[PDB]
Scaffold this active site. Structure first.
Site, PDB file in Angstrom:
ATOM      1  CG  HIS A  66      53.629  60.348  17.046  1.00  0.00           C
ATOM      2  ND1 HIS A  66      53.823  59.281  17.899  1.00  0.00           N
ATOM      3  CD2 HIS A  66      52.517  60.977  17.485  1.00  0.00           C
ATOM      4  CE1 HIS A  66      52.876  59.270  18.818  1.00  0.00           C
ATOM      5  NE2 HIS A  66      52.066  60.284  18.587  1.00  0.00           N
TER       6      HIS A  66
ATOM      7  CG  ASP B 258      67.976  12.971  26.032  1.00  0.00           C
ATOM      8  OD1 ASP B 258      68.246  11.754  25.891  1.00  0.00           O
ATOM      9  OD2 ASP B 258      66.932  13.376  26.585  1.00  0.00           O
TER      10      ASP B 258
ATOM     11  CG  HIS C 142      65.596  11.500  23.445  1.00  0.00           C
ATOM     12  ND1 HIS C 142      66.799  12.056  23.063  1.00  0.00           N
ATOM     13  CD2 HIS C 142      64.670  11.975  22.576  1.00  0.00           C
ATOM     14  CE1 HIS C 142      66.610  12.822  22.002  1.00  0.00           C
ATOM     15  NE2 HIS C 142      65.327  12.791  21.687  1.00  0.00           N
TER      16      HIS C 142
ATOM     17  CG  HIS D 139      63.256  10.519  18.041  1.00  0.00           C
ATOM     18  ND1 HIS D 139      62.363  11.473  17.599  1.00  0.00           N
ATOM     19  CD2 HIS D 139      64.085  11.149  18.907  1.00  0.00           C
ATOM     20  CE1 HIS D 139      62.642  12.630  18.174  1.00  0.00           C
ATOM     21  NE2 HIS D 139      63.686  12.463  18.968  1.00  0.00           N
TER      22      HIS D 139
ATOM     23  CG  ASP E 242      61.880  15.063  20.630  1.00  0.00           C
ATOM     24  OD1 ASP E 242      62.428  14.321  21.469  1.00  0.00           O
ATOM     25  OD2 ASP E 242      62.329  15.228  19.481  1.00  0.00           O
TER      26      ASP E 242
HETATM   27  C1  LIG Z   1      68.528  15.552  19.905  1.00  0.00           C
HETATM   28  C2  LIG Z   1      69.519  14.957  20.869  1.00  0.00           C
HETATM   29  S1  LIG Z   1      70.397  13.647  20.138  1.00  0.00           S
HETATM   30  C3  LIG Z   1      69.958  13.439  18.586  1.00  0.00           C
HETATM   31  C4  LIG Z   1      70.704  12.637  17.777  1.00  0.00           C
HETATM   32  C5  LIG Z   1      70.225  12.449  16.500  1.00  0.00           C
HETATM   33  C6  LIG Z   1      69.103  13.102  16.096  1.00  0.00           C
HETATM   34  C7  LIG Z   1      68.398  13.884  16.890  1.00  0.00           C
HETATM   35  C8  LIG Z   1      68.847  14.088  18.175  1.00  0.00           C
HETATM   36  S1  FES Z   2      57.103  58.259  16.329  1.00  0.00           S
HETATM   37 FE1  FES Z   2      55.869  58.341  18.142  1.00  0.00          FE
HETATM   38  S2  FES Z   2      55.870  56.284  18.901  1.00  0.00           S
HETATM   39 FE2  FES Z   2      57.214  56.270  17.180  1.00  0.00          FE
HETATM   40 FE   LIG Z   3      64.198  13.887  20.280  1.00  0.00          FE
END
Ligand SMILES: CCSc1ccccc1
Ligand code: FES
Ligand SMILES: [Fe+3]
Ligand SMILES: CCSc1ccccc1
Ligand SMILES: CCSc1ccccc1
Ligand code: FES
Ligand code: FES
Ligand SMILES: [Fe+3]
Ligand SMILES: [Fe+3]
Lengths: 192, 446, 446, 446, 192, 192
Positions: free
Chosen positions: C104, C205, C208, C213, C362
């Site tokens: 509106h 982490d 992992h 990786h 991942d």
């Molecule tokens: C992502 C948790 S640890 C990590 C370290 C290096 C690269 C990517 C991740």
């Molecule tokens: S002007 Fe009416 S919903 Fe935004």
């Molecule tokens: Fe990772």
């Protein structure tokens, strides 16, 4: 095709088949492929005025129908079998084009993204109007907008194309019988 | 949520909690207190004119078969087999004397009766009580000038009383015009909006037209076109708004007989409606004959909407809190030339159908307003419908109902949501009535 | 589920019920007790540097507009119209003095104020109280060296206090380096994981990396590459882990300034970081200058993560219990040559963006661990985070926070989940504080 | 919903509330009272014949690893890592001595034991109690002639007792034939039906065959073909129906050894089964030898079904109330020539596999009957299973169980749903037993 | 195309159109179709080393961008309009290929399944480098894995191809402006 | 392709590649495109008897498999690797065709809608049977029914075609290794 034997085939579909099975002209299929690929490119980049100027004949009927689901054995109920999602002459296409290009068409910001995939191209000259070209092709149309809205359309297109101004072949009829009865794409606001 | 106590709609319908467009528990509650209780649009005489003709329709999330009987009446039944619950009919329209289930072959009549059971004698003997195994029937089916509505609740008011003060406005076009026909089949599209978003828009939203539909107004060359981009406000006296006890309401835009139709139909329509208006003056008086050829944007509570003169006819079929299946038909006057009817029907779909360029303008508005109703920080926020409050009247000498004598306002939002809240907080029709005994006073306060 | 009583995280953060990654009721509860209560990342000065510049951002499932004011401050508002709740802004970034609703036409300023209403005089007269109709404003918006965070809860600690002991570790890179810039736009991808799965992975982490990786380590020729396929363990003293009162934590891998970047950037980066470190020794001391050029894998509670030096910056935007929208930006040091900034940004996306080959390693881990949380036999099972327990310290003379003096462990899991449980079982900040008055003692038990 | 009190299945199993095919809360309740309590099909000896061979299988919505041990036994374990809950195995079958998690590299033996942890000495020292960190084991794993079933509930009856009176019927084909093999891998397709829809169909639905499968009967040239379009009723004495205490049941169609197989297999099969029957007469008596070569449509409660002789073997794996993952194997007799086994397996998939033309006939029936269970007006409606009631016997001198001595009826529906209701309303096996102490009397009333 | 009249068309898109509308060489379109079909086959069977050897030029830039959603009327905000999902030279593609082939790429077991659909092929020689071939084509890429994971990608590809070793035409530039802003495919770890 | 170097490539896939990379005949690719486009048209209009008569050889094997997911490093487990979703001779295809055409096939009312997109066509003559034509192509198959049911199939097709009666080229083998292990399309009751 005998449709008394091939029970699932419609008379219209059997007639359209006959058109392409006869005279096959490889050069015509290639011309048709070019015509449709260029048309799809203009539409994909949203060059709608260019599409009208270069691809669409002044006498065009641009029609997409949605057919009501009826029993395969139905032979009594006779009311309107289909509605027209599109049934546009040139001026009506122009209205839709102006609507797309209007700077207060809020739905077009941010700009939409279109990608069209045209396949299964067949072409044949009309047997009685030697300047009328029948072209059949299928389209997958991908429309993406607003981050995570994605709509994919699927259709077969029965076209007639004819040489117009400057000898350029232009669309004088497109007919699509849209295969999904209930649209799951928010709308059918795309040019198939 | 306690629906007896929770204020979802504030006093006088001035605001609604945004959660109403998003909450799935409330959607489930609406299936009971809105859709199972109220009158819902099914079909028109013109789509099932002959004995045996049937269509399928949604009533809320349920599907029904709607069938013309041999005696000329119409009966409607759940599209569910009484044996093990398979969907009986899988098509949208046809003609049949009965329906056979594709699972175990049980055969039901067009009258809902269980007429045959395969090998009944060998299998069930005399033990199957077929008289008690008819299709579950819609309790109430009534007509308003060919337009057929159904209601699951035997206790509902008659359809005419349910239309209340809105009937007076619809009659010139629905009755005195000689009658309307519904042109099928409908367009059908799913949108990611709550059913209330388009329902509220059609019932009372003239404010949005100039801005939402700026591009359609500018491009589409219709009569309402001066409004594009809020370039101009309709003059004083350009129209009015009304609402009623049971929730139905509409806007009236005086003289707008060609509606949203493009210039290619404007002269023909304006000639046709004006000619009929001249005849109707002598029959129903000047005011009502003028109403006949005036553009009405109306919602018949809860989820049936229309634009008379434009000829747009809508059902907002509920799927879940953010999903609605939109059915779009065209309405035409029976005595219009057939070629005009055909072009009018195409123009209805061109503007408001599945590829309706006007309807497309509304998508983002209704989808995002609905989806925001699920967002944590918006659930308890207030949607506003206070425009024109304190200037509505009731019992006017000429125009009945709760009426705002201006073309743009939120009078009809207030009446729609007043009825909605009264239903959601009530267990039956008697309680709705008790909750509505001062309905017009509440709407005209201040 | 009774969140006051249900033990979702065991004493000392040693384990968590697997249902926490899958339960939708808990997800809804998190919208209140986690996302509506805590500080969430919005944007950086570098993305909205000039008056009128704005971006949209998610805060939990809500969307906000984040706008640079004329006075140089930043304010943030719900991206929802105050009239009937339509989404105001549909783009991701731009420059404007205001935002007009497409429904509106209501016009809001960059300051959130309702500045204009179409035809206000004719329609509302003097009755519309625009002063009370400003966009719903995010109560708290604060900066940490250009990084802009928001919080819906007025009662939250200041952002600096909220970072707690983690601030000391971030400052060498965030402050003493001369400052960082965020390079946009972010990559955006939806994963079928709970937001806590990547949040916990980035917070603590290191275990992992060698195994998950392995292929990226072997192929991508980075400095951390000795670890591929657990071929080698980082030597003693290779790094440490820390965590803090309000849940933020990180791993520190000493000297790893080139991070995950492939050999094509290693010599240039190692030269650049070493050169700046030599300057910083004299300013902030040897330890903190070394921390500047050491790889930090950090989560700023709840759902903002980063790898300094690698330059990866993440938002884990919650959608539902098994759906998360991952936003990935690059961070660069302002005083790096522009060509290096460009190549660093590309390398961030190459490794951790939408087609990030490291990040792809991942996917299955985080998606299946999340989805298993919905499975009947796993809901009540215990996710383990006990590695290194009984060897953490607090109040160390050099390294602040709860600290494990080893590169690989689950110290930061424990602090993250201790804070998580304290929030989920509390109704407000005062209760969180009461539930956290012995936070470091709980984490260093045994 | 109070499952202790709610009558979902009426006395004698005569009807069920339609909501049982649609209600998601009940689906969640079934995970506990049906799937976590009862015996579920896992695999066959023929698919994991050698030490180290394993497959994955669903048990309800949980996934398990099913492994052949060195001692020749089979053990099954949740496919979930004991560390942080990642899915351990991502393939469907193989051979291994153990499974290593792709997240942090924990290694589990084929016996479920935690055998190795990367860098355990350096990281955990002696503090990781690996003996307590084995994969969560399926409590009960038993075989019925090579067919391996699992049960999460230690208190379950032995598999043989659980099969109850159905075992007597299965033994001629499962045992006395010399044994069956399962031919893998299975076809796998998701249908939008409740798991109970195909389960009930296979347990006791001969009524549907002539009508549902009219086109497959007419086209596919099998022996049961006289039935197409209900053109003919099977003569008196053509078969029988049975059901049992714990819910399993089946139809018996006398002599139908070629089943649904097309004419290209009919002469060969009818010769093979007749030849073996002649040998079995002397071993197990004429009646049981005849049962061997008679077509059994059986459901082993809750969600394992089969057609003996046709050789179709099904698992209806539950996903949600309207979603089921259909696994389709072929069963063959071990002593059949290999070429016949191959053609039989292909024919099983041709008729009932992912592109099974017979199975396709059932799609709409089962999907719509399931989906209608969510529709408002059908939730509280009654699905009927009264065909043949009052003519069932128990304790017959020749045929054990609750038996209807007719080929077409709903005897097996009644026993299936009697057991279902007894489980849904019980907290454990002892309560099920108490609720079932007069099971056959209830089924044979009147 | 006049982009002042065709308001929705970008200058870049209008330039790319002009390239194909002029000289049309049917033989070149056919060569291009073969080149792209063979490339897609190698990728579909995960012959990534063969793809590098046979299809990818040493000087390649392989780029896929994601463009930030901005207002159609935006003319003040000037910061980085796009990020690079891919922006790879040959050595960077090789790293990605080695990552795919590594036996400790756990995500590749069980083996993935790829199916590519290439359509709308257009080809034109560069007007100034007569050895530079411009090829445009659209791709649908279907990736299936792990039983029930299915991801479908849709894109238009602007390529440059040039004869390299042995006279084999190889990719020297691919540019894709990915049409979906927020990916709903878990990642974009596929070679478009 | 050396599959010892290109570790992810199967021996079968490497052999099929070799077939098309060698002799390239443009005319054959065009013939193949026509053959497949006409086949897809007959199937799309549900002219199943016409499809059998015109497109399918008497000696046909029509096969679609589903392969069990196994470890990439698996080298001990040897049991049946795949099942047959289809493995039909001509008479078995005829049974399926009669099932489609039967007036008591309730699932075919209301009439289904099919749209097929055929791409990536490659063709090569067999080196040893000079009358055997190898054709490879990919298909997207869209099936819509019952208002809102939409199923999309994706596959690569390895065909052999041979001249039969009247010299008409007909399908003598189709092999599809279906890429999705768990079907999410209700069934695979479509002719790929
Ligand atoms: C992502 C948790 S640890 C990590 C370290 C290096 C690269 C990517 C991740
Ligand atoms: S002007 Fe009416 S919903 Fe935004
Ligand atoms: Fe990772
Ligand atoms: C739809 C509410 S008002 C209105 C008026 C004219 C056309 C369309 C709508
Ligand atoms: C499936 C229930 S009965 C039956 C009998 C024969 C074939 C198939 C089914
Ligand atoms: S479900 Fe309809 S006849 Fe059985
Ligand atoms: S989740 Fe399996 S080893 Fe950590
Ligand atoms: Fe509108
Ligand atoms: Fe069946």
């Amino acid at each position: 095709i005998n449709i008394q034997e091939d029970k699932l085939v419609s008379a219209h579909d059997a007639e359209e088949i006959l058109r392409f099975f006869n005279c096959h002209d490889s050069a015509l299929q290639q011309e048709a492929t070019t015509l449709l690929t260029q048309e799809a490119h203009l539409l994909d980049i949203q060059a709608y005025r260019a599409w009208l100027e270069h691809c669409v004949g002044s006498e065009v009927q641009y029609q997409v129908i949605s057919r009501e689901l009826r029993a395969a054995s139905e032979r009594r109920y006779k009311l309107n079998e289909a509605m027209n999602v599109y049934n546009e002459n040139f001026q009506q296409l122009k209205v839709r084009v102006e609507h797309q290009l209007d700077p207060q068409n809020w739905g077009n910001s941010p700009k939409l993204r279109f990608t069209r995939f045209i396949t299964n191209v067949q072409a044949a000259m009309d047997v009685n109007d030697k300047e009328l070209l029948h072209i059949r092709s299928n389209v997958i149309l991908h429309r993406a907008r607003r981050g995570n809205q994605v709509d994919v359309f699927y259709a077969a297109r029965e076209d007639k194309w004819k040489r117009g101004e400057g000898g350029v072949r232009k669309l004088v009829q497109r007919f699509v019988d849209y295969p999904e009865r209930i649209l799951q794409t928010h709308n059918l606001m795309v040019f198939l | 949520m306690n629906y007896n106590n929770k204020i979802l709609v504030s006093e006088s319908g001035l605001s609604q909690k945004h959660l109403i467009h998003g909450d799935e528990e409330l959607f489930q509650h609406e299936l009971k207190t809105i859709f199972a209780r109220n009158w819902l649009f099914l079909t028109h005489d013109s789509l099932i004119p002959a004995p045996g003709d049937y269509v399928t329709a949604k009533m809320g999330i349920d599907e029904v078969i709607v069938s013309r009987q041999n005696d000329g009446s119409i009966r409607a039944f759940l599209n569910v087999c009484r044996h093990r619950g398979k969907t009986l009919v899988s098509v949208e329209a046809g003609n049949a004397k009965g329906f056979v289930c594709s699972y175990h072959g049980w055969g039901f009549g067009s009258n809902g009766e269980l007429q045959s059971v395969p090998f009944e004698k060998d299998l069930y003997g005399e033990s199957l009580n077929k008289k008690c195994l008819g299709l579950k029937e819609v309790a109430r089916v009534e007509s308003f000038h060919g337009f057929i509505y159904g209601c699951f609740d035997q206790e509902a008011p008659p359809l005419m009383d349910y239309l209340g003060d809105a009937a007076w406005y619809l009659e010139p076009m629905f009755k005195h015009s000689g009658g309307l026909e519904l042109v099928g089949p409908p367009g059908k599209v799913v949108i990611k909006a709550n059913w209330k978003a388009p329902a509220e828009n059609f019932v009372g939203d003239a404010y949005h037209v100039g801005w939402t539909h700026a591009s359609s107004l500018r491009s589409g060359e219709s009569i309402f076109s001066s409004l594009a981009g809020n370039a101009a406000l309709p003059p004083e006296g350009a129209g009015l708004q009304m609402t009623s006890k049971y929730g139905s309401g509409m806007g009236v835009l005086w003289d707008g007989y060609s509606g949203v139709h493009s210039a290619d139909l404007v002269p023909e329509l304006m000639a046709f409606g004006g000619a009929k208006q001249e005849r109707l003056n002598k029959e129903i008086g000047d005011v009502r004959a003028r109403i006949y050829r005036s553009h009405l944007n109306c919602t018949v509570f809860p989820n049936n909407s229309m634009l008379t003169c434009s000829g747009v006819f809508k059902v907002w079929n509920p799927i879940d809190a953010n999903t609605t299946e939109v059915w779009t038909y065209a309405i035409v006057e029976k005595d219009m030339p057939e070629d005009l009817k055909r072009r009018l029907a195409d123009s209805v779909q061109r503007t408001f159908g599945p590829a309706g360029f006007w309807e497309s303008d509304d998508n983002d508005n209704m989808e995002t307003a609905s989806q925001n109703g699920k967002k944590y920080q918006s659930r308890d926020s207030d949607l506003l419908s206070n425009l024109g409050f304190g200037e509505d009247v009731y019992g006017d000498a000429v125009y009945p109902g709760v009426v705002g004598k201006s073309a743009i306002g939120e009078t009809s939002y207030r009446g729609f949501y007043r009825a909605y809240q009264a239903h959601v907080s009530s267990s039956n029709w008697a309680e709705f009535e008790h909750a509505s005994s001062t309905w017009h006073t509440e709407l005209t306060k201040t």
